[PDB]
């Protein structure tokens, strides 16, 4: 609806500015303002364009003001497609956005590979990801390149614990001499096992 | 010469000469079964000649595989192969197949299996190669002199309470 | 190390029974994370929540360990930086604990060396034991038809007032007191008086030497407790037994009464979570919950845990999903029948419906 | 919006075997066939059938193949009509699937015409009255529940009672010499069973690859998705209808199993937004089955003799599906597991079977009288059995004890070895003529064979075989007596 | 020259072992029933399977591994391919997951393949020896057959299948590898300890060389339990499509349905009977249709299925139990009452059936089985309704069906033949097992020096294949077979039974009782 | 007779309860999965 309304006038940046004002205003509104929201009474929204203000009232009537962010993203995607702009998301660690020289090179290389985006203009948008501590990632039209790394004190073993000495019963060759001494040989094996278990 | 057809009426490849050559170039007779497997996959059912070549490889091969296999027996493999040929392929073993079995029995020293194979050849085929019959008897009488006619533990006297039931 | 989400602030968005939704501006913490309600709310005790699901990138569903009375929306909640941890070590011996690991014996501080999370992964295949031996209980029916295995899993399936508790006490007297290793008593959805009677019994037998070394730990979340606590007391009690098995290589006895209440508690919360019920009305994840819990109750190459679990059969229907699924997780099964008890036969074991795994000549004589 | 051929739509939702398609120009008519033209790296083509209209643009459909590798917004093209199957004598001796594509790997089939699988059933004015006995060569069926030419026959049974075996025997006895054509529809059954049937038919020369065949096979089996199993029956029925109407021939139609058609629809019913019904079956159970059954009928143009196998889940004949099928049949054969467990095959429970032509006007008076007497004797023998259990056989009065002895012979004389179950039984089958069966039972009822041993009637054919088995029994008994005498 | 993945969206919600995904605007999108990777870290991924594609664009995902690492908002990459797992002879003797990952112990095959076509199959004519006399005689099993094993808990459902796998070890060592039977044992929802015990048991008999284990323990998510049968059969289809025979055991399908029910309900699928999803029959139906006997044109390989199913109080009227019974080509019903009555294996012959019939029996076993079947049928009816021959031999046949380990074909067939021809009429029922033990594991003729046979002796294990070729009732083997049995019967009766019947001492009585019970567990 | 009648009666009541719960459970799922679109009404008209 916003895209169709803006297309008639031919100006799309007005809606983007309205979203920026909404985001700035929301930062000061009380928690859970979207459920007691009255856009008419809110002075911050009084400066918005007619299409944006109408849509906000439209959401408030249906109680879907919680989708303000998603609606904005869908709109920005339409504007970029209409204006032939390809946005590359550069995911970087918090505070690691200072160096993006390699990210731009990777984004350009991905842009060259994509034939569909030959005429599209390359844009870079930085995003902060707490899952990566070092490096960066680049996403463009679904093509994702990862050049990042993340994070890499328990009790390992019981020193007191000792594996018991697994005894083995001695086996005698099956000759006649064994049969005559079967009882005697068995006693020796039992004594041997008892010695092994106790130690001596 | 004449096209063969399978169970469903589809034709089967009959040129099984190259496979026989492959069988006759194996070192261990277990590799021969692989050739038979490939033949079946390629819709080239083995003929009587192919089975005889497989039996020849079994008799002339050193062992089943490069590494020893416990409880491996050449006689058992050949008999199973014959069972497959006669029952699951409807092909009557010829004299050549039975001669290979008799040779293996003589070579391995199993003189009791030779007697059974001797009667089989005297029943289905026309007699037995008299060279092999005499060889089997020589092996049997050697056992009598050495006393290895039956396993010894069988000859040991037992009783109602003198038998160890594992 | 320190968790990257500790101190994270969220606000209560929805309250239904024992289920509470929390919205975090910076992102919902990981599942199983523990949260504390900061607002006073005029409550008499603190309020703690455990995350169980993620509704979106910012909203998370949680179960409260205490009653949710006087809980309002927008209430402030703070992440604790990790799962629910409980004390471990010899400091816990001779002590009574709850689901949260807080001592409820009104005695001195535990002073544990460290704490460990209740939720943990089960032993893997290579860490399984292969020892089979007979545990002599002194009871004719058990020792003959369904002998128990040392370090194994034993279940006592029974109805209401059939004798499940009595047999457990008999086993405790005949085994636990004369046991070299340690013991852990996990009361789950059972009478509070029984725990008091057991505590007095253990003190009289001097298994709990208040002034000396003790061999027993008690962990109790009883019927009066809300469903959230009754669904986690078993995990906490099992965690303590795992430390002794793994970090001390010590034989452990684990007396759980009653395991059925654990599944029942998960059913109650599942209904509130907005899940489609399975047959009868149990949660669809009945089997998975038992599998995760039971698989942790096993004997590894480091130590041994002999587990005895009481199973309550609702309406005397042995085909109920709860008891039915538990048969596959037990080495020994002891089925009790009401009719046998009514005939004056105690114990009421039905030997035909009982089974044991060590009923093998290779193991027993 | 008259001709929708080539109309384009996009896949909007995919859940299991149900797919939602969006058309900008309007959803085509229900039951329309659509092809997934998009290249999704699939090993098999994907086709859908419209079953519902969600709105003027969205339509819900069931896929005939697996929906794997299917993405949203995938392009779909209408085929301009319902699913079409080839018809004519060129299909004889061939195997087809739900879509009418040959799967016998026997080369292209020359089709001069194709017909939609969905058609309107005949009206009341298109009903033909054909009351003629069909001789199946089976003592039980020919006597108690004789079959009628051009009529409908159901074989209700559990699992392992012998539903498939009886169908094979009927084919061997009725189809080999049938003047007309035959159509066999495998529906949600074992694939190996179809393979065995194909081999047997080729051996029996019903399907003559080099010559002329006289039967068609249509197979949608368990491995197939529910969409295929819910339409394979329609496809085969369409072929039979063409033979009935265009060719004006008397055709046989074997179906195994018709229950799977109901089962498949129930599986997809949940995903179509239909609240379940009693025993979890779809609410449209009665109507959907009725439309299919009414198409299976003999009209003034031709005749269709239909034999359908019905699976009774857990031997519960009170279940919706088995019960709903009873009113759409002319002859019901109910099989009981208890009979089979006693060694009696076919395990038919005559007290539960019924036939429409069991009237003196249609069949001979002697045939009607003999059948009724057998049923009454069997019914009485059951009541005497209960008294036997409580009192003992000796306590029964002499008249009752005679009914017991005669009735037991009837129970064993109903058994018959089939020519197709030789492997199961190990004995050659028998083909008993209709007249022989009537005469044999008539003599048995009046006590003409009271002195014959009871076991002489077990697993035999006509009366002549009974006498031969009694003579053999006497000879062996004499030999045993001689052996004992020498001792 | 980059390893560019295909990102398709983010993780929205997580509910236990399943998740939901929200697609990012303007992305390629994911395909149905495909594998996806949830980036739990810049280098670590969790496997998921696509299950639903909703109108809103949300995607239902079944998690398979690293579930604890999954959090809302994480990125998702689409591989765009179905599930493929390693397959080959290099996996034998190993424990693996449904995903192919090996489990430490103390070629790619597609998991969603279609079943063989009707014309791609051949009639079942090759037997698969379970090693148990009762099954091999009254319930024949042929290669390429689906034989259900239905019973109550603690009735031997697992033991019999494991014994069947073990029984192939001795055969495979002798015959060529062409006819060797490979084994795929699939454990579903079972305890981890039981898998380890099974692994050790197979290793002891050396069955690991021809067997592989696919384990999805209880602690594992339902997704793995749901895919284990399909992954296991896929590993078995590798040998089928290459002219080899395989045996797939599923322990057990009952827990697979529970996992499928758990997945469907969590993903908002409408419940059906007993809360199971509507398409629960189609699940097992396509699993067991993949086991077949390929035609000569395709290699002749086969897959034999032994799915296991548990009942409650001997109730076979359940939902999934009925569905499986209507699919398989035969059922082995293990009865609780028989199990407690001393009959082990507790195979209920009356309720058990094999629809393949005698076609799945060797020519040697056909004659024995056919005549044995009639005797038992009469024996059941005679007792139900007098020392007649059918009643005298029927009891001894029942006694011979008690076993603890699989029996070699030669030993089993010979014993059945002896009881069939009345050689055991003079032998008391209690002493039948002791008679069998002496016949197999010792030789009385040699011991007492009255043996005149030339070749036919029970210690010549190579005679099994000769018997399997010519039949026992053949002139080559029949003459010596009768002589050996006659000598064994006479010697046994004279020297053993006479003393056994003369025992009155309590010590002697107790000693005899231990002997006979041991003989049950020996032969 | 008295005993069998008691179990017969407990079954018939349970069968009625079980079947209805099953049907209700499948009705709830569709209700839960029911999707409400944007209310395309004149909100300013009020
Ligand atoms: N071994 C026994 N000997 C004598 N009486 C017994 C025995 N076991 C149980 N009883 C009787 O049964 C009653 C109930 O036993 P118990 O406390 O063990 O029940 P339970 O199985 O724990 O059931 P629940 O906890 O649900 O009430 C006892 O109070 C006692 O009267
Ligand atoms: N033929 C047999 N003879 C004697 N004992 C047997 C035999 N088969 C199995 N058993 C024993 O019976 C018990 C149950 O066997 P098994 O593990 O196979 O049962 P099951 O059907 O898998 O039951 P569940 O898996 O539900 O425990 C075990 O103690 C096993 O050793
Ligand atoms: N005429 C018969 N004689 C003997 N056994 C039979 C006969 N008919 C069926 N059976 C038994 O039933 C099996 C075949 O079952 P089948 O015909 O497929 O039944 P269904 O399709 O109803 O499950 C046979 O293997 C055998 O055990
Ligand atoms: Mg109690
Ligand atoms: Mg059938
Ligand atoms: Mg088992």
Please write down the HEC assignment for all residues of C21-59. Answer: EEEECCCCCCCCCEEEECCCCCCCCCCEEEEEEECCCCE
Annotated binding residue E159: yes
Per-residue tokens: A145: 């390149």
Kind of pairing between the strands at C332-335 and C153-158: parallel
Experimental method: cryo-EM
Per-residue tokens: C190: 């059972």
- Gyration radius of chain F over CA positions: 22
* Ligand 3 site, residue D219, Cβ cutoff 6 A: no
CB-CB neighbours of E468 under 10 Å:
21
Question: Residue B13, SS3?
Answer: coil
Structural element, H or E, at residue A18: helix A13-26
Length of chain F equals 46
Kind of pairing between the strands at D182-187 and D250-256: parallel
- CA atoms of D350 and E381, how far apart (whole Å): 22
> Which of A69, A160, A161 to probe by mutation at the C interface, max C CB count within 10 Å?
A161
- CA atoms of D462 and D474, how far apart (whole Å): 19
Nearest CA to ligand 2 atom 26: E153
Of E53, E118, E331, the CB nearest to D15: E53
- CA atoms of D362 and D368, how far apart (whole Å): 9
Strands (E), chain F: none
Using an 8 Å Cβ cutoff, are D377 and D405 in contact? Answer: no
Nearest alpha carbon to residue C231 among C178, C272, C280: C272
By the CB criterion, residues less than 5 angstroms from ion ligand 6 are E 158
- CA atoms of D274 and D60, how far apart (whole Å): 13
Instruction: For D107, list phi and psi in degrees, rounded to 5.
Output: 95, 170
Residue whose entry in the numeric block shows the structure tokens 């020369």: D205
What residues does C254 pair with on adjacent strands? C184, C307
- CA atoms of D309 and D257, how far apart (whole Å): 5
How many angstroms does the Cα of residue E159 sit away from the middle of ligand 6? 7
Structural element, H or E, at residue D331: strand D331-334
Contacts of residue C6, defined as CB under 8 A and 6 or more positions apart, other chains included, come to: C79, C80, C81, C82
- CA atoms of D263 and D281, how far apart (whole Å): 8
DSSP D172: I
Question: Residue A193, SS3?
Answer: helix
Nearest CA to ligand 3 atom 9: D162
Nearest CA to ligand 2 atom 31: C360
How many angstroms does the Cα of residue C305 sit away from the middle of ligand 6? 23
- CA atoms of A72 and A67, how far apart (whole Å): 9
- CA atoms of E435 and E453, how far apart (whole Å): 20
Nearest alpha carbon to residue D29 among D67, D78, D86: D78
Residue whose entry in the numeric block shows the structure tokens 């007697």: B115
How many angstroms does the Cα of residue E140 sit away from the middle of ligand 6? 22
Using an 8 Å Cβ cutoff, are D410 and D444 in contact? Answer: yes
Question: Residue A85, SS3?
Answer: strand
Which entry of D89, D114, D149, D190 is annotated as an active-site residue? D190
Using an 8 Å Cβ cutoff, are C168 and C311 in contact? Answer: no
Interface check for E408 against chain B (CB to CB < 8 A): the answer is no
Contacts of residue C64, defined as CB under 8 A and 6 or more positions apart, other chains included, come to: C18, C19, C20, C47, C48, C49, C226, C228
Q: Is the dihedral of CA C339, C340, C342, C347 positive or negative?
A: negative
Of E26, E27, E42, the CB nearest to A137: E42
Which entry of C90, C150, C191, C302 is annotated as an active-site residue? C191
All partners of chain E with 3 or more CB pairs under 8 angstroms: A, B, C, D, F
Question: Residue E128, SS3?
Answer: coil
* Alpha-helical segments (H) within A34-173: 50-62, 68-83, 101-113
Per-residue tokens: D39: 């290249």
| CB < 8 Å to C274, chain F | 32
Per-residue tokens: D415: 């058994």
Q: Which atom of ligand 2 is nearest to the CA of C356?
A: 29
User: Which chain E residues in 39-58 lie under 8 Å from chain A, judged by CB atoms?
Assistant: 39-43
CA distance D220 to chain F (A): 29
Contacts of residue E172, defined as CB under 8 A and 6 or more positions apart, other chains included, come to: E180, E181, E210
Using an 8 Å Cβ cutoff, are C293 and C238 in contact? Answer: yes
Question: Residue E373, SS3?
Answer: helix
Cβ <8 Å between F38 and A62: yes
How many angstroms does the Cα of residue E195 sit away from the middle of ligand 2? 14
Structural element, H or E, at residue E76: strand E75-78
* Ligand 2 site, residue E336, Cβ cutoff 6 A: no
Question: Residue E3, SS3?
Answer: coil
Using an 8 Å Cβ cutoff, are C163 and C347 in contact? Answer: yes
- Exposure of B2 by Cβ count < 10 A (0-12 exposed, 13-18 middle, 19+ buried)? exposed
DSSP E149: E
The helix/strand count (H/E) of chain F reads as 1, 0
- Exposure of E287 by Cβ count < 10 A (0-12 exposed, 13-18 middle, 19+ buried)? buried
Interface check for F32 against chain C (CB to CB < 8 A): the answer is yes
- Exposure of D388 by Cβ count < 10 A (0-12 exposed, 13-18 middle, 19+ buried)? middle
Length of chain D equals 487
Vertex E89, ends E85 and E90: CA angle to 5°? Answer: 75
CB-CB neighbours of B146 under 10 Å:
8
Cis omega (within 30 of 0) for bond into C347: yes
**Resolution expressed in Å:** 3.7
Instruction: For B22, list phi and psi in degrees, rounded to 5.
Output: -60, -40
Length of chain E equals 523
Contacts of residue E361, defined as CB under 8 A and 6 or more positions apart, other chains included, come to: E127, E136, E140, E369
Question: Residue E41, SS3?
Answer: strand
Q: Is the dihedral of CA F31, F32, F37, F38 positive or negative?
A: positive
Annotated binding residue E193: no
* Alpha-helical segments (H) within chain C: 140-144, 164-171, 192-204, 227-230, 233-247, 259-273, 286-296, 321-326, 338-342
How far out from the chain centre does Cα E112 lie?
Answer: 22
Query: Ligand 3, residues D140, D141, D162: which to mutate, most atoms within 8 A of Cβ?
Result: D162
Nearest alpha carbon to residue C6 among C38, C29, C32: C29
Q: Is the dihedral of CA E55, E58, E60, E64 positive or negative?
A: positive
- CA atoms of D425 and D435, how far apart (whole Å): 26
How far is the CA of A51 from the CAs of A17, A33, A46, in angstroms? 12, 21, 12
How far out from the chain centre does Cα D190 lie?
Answer: 14
Cβ <8 Å between F29 and E273: no
Cβ <8 Å between E297 and B43: yes
The DSSP code sequence of A118-169 is GSSEEEEEEEE-TT-SEEEEEEETTEEEEEEE---------SS---------
Interface check for F31 against chain C (CB to CB < 8 A): the answer is no
Cβ <8 Å between B160 and E496: yes
Q: Which residue of D has its CA nearest to B6?
A: D199
The DSSP code sequence of E134-168 is HHHHHS--BTT-B-EEEEESSSSHHHHHHHHHHHH
Nearest alpha carbon to residue C223 among C258, C250, C255: C258
Q: C-alpha dihedral over B108, B110, B113, B119, to 10 degrees?
A: 80
- CA atoms of E424 and E397, how far apart (whole Å): 10
CB-CB neighbours of D260 under 10 Å:
28
- CA atoms of B88 and E468, how far apart (whole Å): 13
- Gyration radius of chain E over CA positions: 27
Ligand nearest to the CA of C355: 2
Vertex D37, ends D35 and D40: CA angle to 5°? Answer: 115
CA distance C16 to chain F (A): 17
Q: C-alpha dihedral over D187, D191, D196, D200, to 10 degrees?
A: 40
Query: Ligand 3, residues E325, E353, E355: which to mutate, most atoms within 8 A of Cβ?
Result: E355
Per-residue tokens: E99: 């995903």
Question: Residue E200, SS3?
Answer: helix
DSSP D333: E
Residue whose entry in the numeric block shows the structure tokens 């002749």: E300
Length of chain C equals 365
Query: Do C and A touch (≥3 CB pairs < 8 Å)?
Result: yes
What residues does C134 pair with on adjacent strands? C149
All partners of chain C with 3 or more CB pairs under 8 angstroms: A, E, F
Cβ <8 Å between D202 and B10: no
Using an 8 Å Cβ cutoff, are D276 and F22 in contact? Answer: yes
Question: Residue C76, SS3?
Answer: strand
**Residue-wise over C279-302: b if at least 16 C-beta within 10 A, else e?**
bbebbbbbbbbbbbbbbbbbbbeb
Using an 8 Å Cβ cutoff, are E266 and C275 in contact? Answer: yes
- CA atoms of E370 and E388, how far apart (whole Å): 19
Cβ <8 Å between E271 and F26: yes
What residues does C187 pair with on adjacent strands? C220, C257
Nearest alpha carbon to residue A76 among C57, E11, E55, E26: E26
CA distance A7 to chain F (A): 21
Question: Residue B14, SS3?
Answer: coil
Of E122, E277, E285, the CB nearest to D223: E285
C-F Cβ pairs (cutoff 8 Å, strict): 7
**Residue-wise over D230-244: b if at least 16 C-beta within 10 A, else e?**
bbbbbbbbbbbbbbb
Structural element, H or E, at residue E325: helix E319-325
């Amino acid at each position: 609806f916003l895209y169709k309304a803006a297309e008639e006038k031919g100006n799309f940046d007005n809606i983007l500015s309205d979203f920026q004002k909404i985001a700035a205003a929301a930062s000061k509104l009380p928690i859970f303002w979207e459920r007691t929201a009255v856009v008419e009474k809110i002075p911050e929204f009084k400066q918005l364009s007619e299409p944006t203000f109408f849509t906000l009232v439209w959401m408030q009537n249906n109680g879907m003001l919680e989708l303000i962010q998603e609606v904005a993203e869908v709109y920005e995607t339409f504007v970029n497609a209409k204006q032939k702009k390809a946005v590359a998301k550069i995911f970087v660690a918090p505070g690691g956005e200072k160096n993006v020289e390699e990210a731009r090179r990777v984004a350009e290389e991905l842009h060259k590979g994509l034939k569909e985006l030959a005429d599209y203009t390359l844009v870079l948008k930085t995003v902060v990801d707490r899952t990566i501590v070092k490096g960066f990632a680049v996403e463009l039209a679904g093509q994702y390149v990862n050049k990042a790394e993340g994070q890499q004190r328990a009790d390992e073993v019981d020193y007191t614990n000792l594996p018991a000495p697994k005894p083995q019963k001695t086996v005698w060759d099956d000759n006649i001499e064994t049969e005559v001494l079967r009882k005697y040989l068995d006693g020796l094996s039992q004594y041997d096992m008892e010695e092994a278990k106790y130690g001596v | 010469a004449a096209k063969k057809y399978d169970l469903f009426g589809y034709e089967v490849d009959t040129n099984t000469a190259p496979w026989i050559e492959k069988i006759k170039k194996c070192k261990y007779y277990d590799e021969a079964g692989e050739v038979l497997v490939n033949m079946n996959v390629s819709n080239c059912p083995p003929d009587i000649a192919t089975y005889n070549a497989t039996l020849q490889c079994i008799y002339q091969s050193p062992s089943k595989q490069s590494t020893p296999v416990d409880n491996e027996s050449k006689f058992c493999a050949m008999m199973d192969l014959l069972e497959e040929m006669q029952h699951r392929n409807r092909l009557k073993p010829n004299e050549e197949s039975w001669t290979w079995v008799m040779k293996e029995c003589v070579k391995s020293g199993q003189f009791r299996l030779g007697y059974c194979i001797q009667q089989v050849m005297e029943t289905e085929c026309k007699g037995c190669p008299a060279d092999l019959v005499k060889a089997n008897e020589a092996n049997a009488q050697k056992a009598k002199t050495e006393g290895k006619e039956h396993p010894g533990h069988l000859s040991q006297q037992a009783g109602l309470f003198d038998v160890k039931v594992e | 190390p320190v968790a990257d989400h500790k101190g994270r602030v969220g606000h209560v968005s929805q309250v239904i029974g024992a289920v509470v939704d929390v919205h975090f501006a910076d992102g919902v913490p990981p599942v199983l994370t523990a949260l504390d309600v900061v607002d006073k709310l005029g409550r008499d005790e603190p309020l703690t929540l455990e995350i169980v699901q993620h509704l979106d990138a910012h909203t998370g569903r949680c179960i409260a360990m205490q009653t949710t009375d006087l809980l309002k929306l927008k209430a402030k909640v703070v992440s604790t930086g990790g799962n629910i941890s409980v004390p471990v070590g010899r400091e816990t011996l001779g002590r009574i604990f709850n689901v949260l690991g807080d001592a409820i014996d009104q005695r001195g501080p535990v002073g544990e060396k460290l704490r460990m999370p209740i939720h943990a992964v089960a032993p893997k295949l290579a860490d399984q034991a292969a020892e089979d031996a007979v545990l002599t209980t002194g009871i004719k029916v058990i020792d003959l038809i369904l002998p128990y295995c040392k370090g194994g899993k034993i279940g006592l399936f029974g109805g209401a007032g059939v004798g499940k508790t009595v047999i457990i006490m008999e086993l405790i007297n005949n085994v636990a007191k004369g046991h070299g290793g340690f013991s852990v008593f996990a009361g789950v959805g059972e009478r509070t008086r029984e725990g008091t009677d057991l505590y007095l019994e253990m003190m009289q037998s001097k298994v709990i030497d208040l002034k000396g070394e003790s061999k027993c730990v008690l962990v109790y979340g009883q019927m009066n407790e809300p469903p959230g606590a009754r669904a986690r007391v078993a995990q906490s009690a099992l965690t303590m037994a795992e430390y002794f098995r793994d970090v001390e290589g010590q034989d452990v006895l684990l007396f759980i009464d009653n395991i059925f209440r654990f599944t029942q508690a998960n059913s109650e919360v599942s209904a509130l979570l907005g899940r489609i019920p399975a047959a009868v009305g149990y949660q669809p994840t009945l089997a998975e919950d038992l599998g995760q819990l039971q698989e942790r109750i096993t004997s590894t190459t480091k130590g041994s845990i002999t587990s005895v679990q009481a199973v309550y059969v609702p309406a005397d229907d042995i085909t109920d999903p709860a008891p039915a699924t538990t048969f596959s997780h037990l080495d020994a099964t002891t089925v009790l029948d009401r009719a046998v008890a009514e005939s004056g036969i105690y114990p009421a074991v039905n030997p035909l419906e009982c089974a044991s795994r060590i009923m093998d000549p290779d193991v027993i004589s | 919006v008259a001709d929708h051929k080539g109309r384009v739509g996009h896949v909007s939702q995919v859940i299991g075997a149900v797919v939602d398609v969006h058309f900008a120009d309007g959803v085509p008519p229900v039951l329309t066939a659509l092809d997934v033209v998009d290249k999704l790296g699939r090993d098999e083509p994907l086709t859908l059938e419209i079953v519902q209209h969600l709105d003027a643009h969205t339509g819900r459909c069931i896929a005939m193949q697996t929906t794997d590798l299917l993405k949203l917004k995938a392009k779909v093209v209408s085929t301009g009509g319902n699913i079409s199957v080839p018809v004519g004598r060129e299909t004889l001796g061939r195997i087809f699937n739900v879509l009418g594509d040959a799967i016998d790997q026997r080369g292209p089939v020359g089709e001069k015409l194709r017909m939609p699988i969905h058609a309107v059933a005949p009206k009341l004015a298109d009903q033909a009255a054909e009351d003629a006995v069909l001789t199946t060569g089976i003592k039980v069926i020919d006597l108690i529940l004789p079959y009628c030419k051009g009529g409908k026959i159901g074989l209700f049974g559990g699992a392992g009672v012998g539903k498939t075996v009886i169908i094979m025997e009927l084919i061997n006895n009725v189809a080999k010499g049938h003047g007309g054509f035959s159509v066999f529809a495998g529906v949600g059954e074992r694939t190996r069973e179809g393979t065995d049937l194909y081999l047997e038919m080729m051996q029996s020369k019903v399907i003559d690859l080099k010559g002329e065949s006289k039967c068609v096979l249509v197979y949608g089996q368990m491995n197939e998705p529910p969409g295929a199993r819910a339409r394979v029956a329609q496809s085969a029925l369409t072929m039979a209808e063409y033979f009935r109407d265009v060719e004006g021939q008397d055709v046989l139609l074997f179906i195994d199993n018709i229950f799977r058609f109901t089962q498949a629809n129930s599986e997809v019913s949940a995903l179509l937004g239909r609240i379940p019904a009693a025993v979890g079956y779809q609410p449209t159970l009665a109507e959907d089955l009725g439309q299919l059954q009414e198409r299976i009928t003999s009209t003034t143009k031709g005749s269709i003799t239909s034999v359908q196998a019905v699976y009774v889940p857990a031997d519960d004949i009170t279940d919706p599906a088995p019960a709903t099928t009873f009113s759409h049949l002319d002859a019901t054969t109910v099989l009981d597991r208890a009979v089979a467990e006693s060694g009696i095959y076919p395990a038919v429970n005559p007290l539960e079977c019924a036939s429409r032509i069991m009237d003196p006007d249609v069949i001979s008076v002697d045939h009607y009288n003999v059948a009724q007497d057998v049923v009454q004797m069997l019914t009485k023998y059951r009541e005497l059995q209960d008294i036997i259990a409580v009192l003992g056989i000796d306590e029964l009065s002499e008249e009752d004890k005679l009914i017991v002895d005669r009735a037991r012979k009837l129970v064993k004389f109903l058994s018959q070895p089939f020519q197709v179950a030789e492997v199961f039984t190990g004995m050659t089958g028998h083909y008993v003529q209709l007249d022989d069966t009537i005469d044999s039972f008539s003599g048995l009822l009046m006590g003409t064979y009271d002195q014959v041993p009871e076991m002489a009637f077990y697993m035999v054919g006509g009366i002549n075989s009974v006498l031969e088995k009694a003579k053999k029994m006497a000879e062996e008994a004499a030999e045993l007596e001689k052996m004992r005498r020498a001792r | 020259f980059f390893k560019t993945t295909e990102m398709i969206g983010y993780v929205h919600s997580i509910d236990g072992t399943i998740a939901t995904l929200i697609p990012a605007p303007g992305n390629p999108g994911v395909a149905y029933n495909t594998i996806i990777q949830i980036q739990v870290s810049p280098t670590t991924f969790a496997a998921g399977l696509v299950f639903n594609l909703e109108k809103d664009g949300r995607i239902g995902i079944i998690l398979m591994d690293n579930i604890t690492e999954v959090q809302s908002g994480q990125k998702v990459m689409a591989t765009g391919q179905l599930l493929h797992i390693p397959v080959g002879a290099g996996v034998l003797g190993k424990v693996v997951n449904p995903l192919g990952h090996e489990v430490p112990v103390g070629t790619l095959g597609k998991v969603d393949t279609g079943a063989p076509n009707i014309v791609s199959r051949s009639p079942v004519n090759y037997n698969l020896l379970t090693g148990f006399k009762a099954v091999d005689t009254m319930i024949p099993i042929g290669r390429g057959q689906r034989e259900l094993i239905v019973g109550d808990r603690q009735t031997g459902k697992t033991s019999i299948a494991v014994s069947t796998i073990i029984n192939q070890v001795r055969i495979n060592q002798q015959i060529l590898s062409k006819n060797a039977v490979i084994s795929i044992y699939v454990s579903i929802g079972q305890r981890c300890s039981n898998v380890a015990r099974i692994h050790r048991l197979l290793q002891s008999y050396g069955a690991l060389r021809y067997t592989t284990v696919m384990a999805a323990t209880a602690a594992e998510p339902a997704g793995l339990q749901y895919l284990a049968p399909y992954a296991g059969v896929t590993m078995g289809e590798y040998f089928m499509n290459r002219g080899r025979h395989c045996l797939c055991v599923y322990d057990d399908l009952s827990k697979q349905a529970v996992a499928y029910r758990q997945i469907s309900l969590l993903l908002r699928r409408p419940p059906g009977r007993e809360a199971y999803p509507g398409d629960v029959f189609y699940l097992h139906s396509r699993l067991l249709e993949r086991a077949a006997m390929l035609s000569p044109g395709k290699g002749g390989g086969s897959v034999t299925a032994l799915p296991i199913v548990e009942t409650l109080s001997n109730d076979v009227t359940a939902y999934i139990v009925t569905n499986v019974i209507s699919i398989t080509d035969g059922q082995i019903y293990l009865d609780t009452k028989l199990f407690t009555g001393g009959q082990r294996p507790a195979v209920n012959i009356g309720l058990s059936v094999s629809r393949v019939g005698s076609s799945a029996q060797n020519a040697a076993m056909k004659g024995v089985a056919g005549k044995l079947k009639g005797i038992l049928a009469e024996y059941r009816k005679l007792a139900a309704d007098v020392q007649t021959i059918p009643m005298i031999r029927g009891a001894r046949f029942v006694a011979l069906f008690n076993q603890k380990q699989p029996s070699y074909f030669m030993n089993a067939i010979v014993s059945l033949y002896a009881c069939l021809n009345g050689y055991l009429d003079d032998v008391k029922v209690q002493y039948v097992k002791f008679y069998e033990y002496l016949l197999v594991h010792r030789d009385l003729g040699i011991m007492y020096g009255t043996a005149k046979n030339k070749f036919f002796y029970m210690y010549v294990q190579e005679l099994n294949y000769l018997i399997r070729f010519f039949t026992l009732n053949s002139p080559i083997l029949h003459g010596e077979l009768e002589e050996m049995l006659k000598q064994h019967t006479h010697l046994f009766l004279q020297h053993y039974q006479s003393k056994m019947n003369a025992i009155k001492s309590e010590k002697d009585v107790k000693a005899l009782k231990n002997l006979l019970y041991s003989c049950k567990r020996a032969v | 007779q008295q005993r069998t009648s008691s179990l017969y009666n407990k079954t018939r009541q349970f069968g009625i309860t079980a079947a209805l719960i099953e049907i209700l459970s499948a009705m709830s799922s569709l209700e839960g999965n029911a999707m409400k679109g944007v209310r395309r009404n004149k909100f300013w008209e009020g």
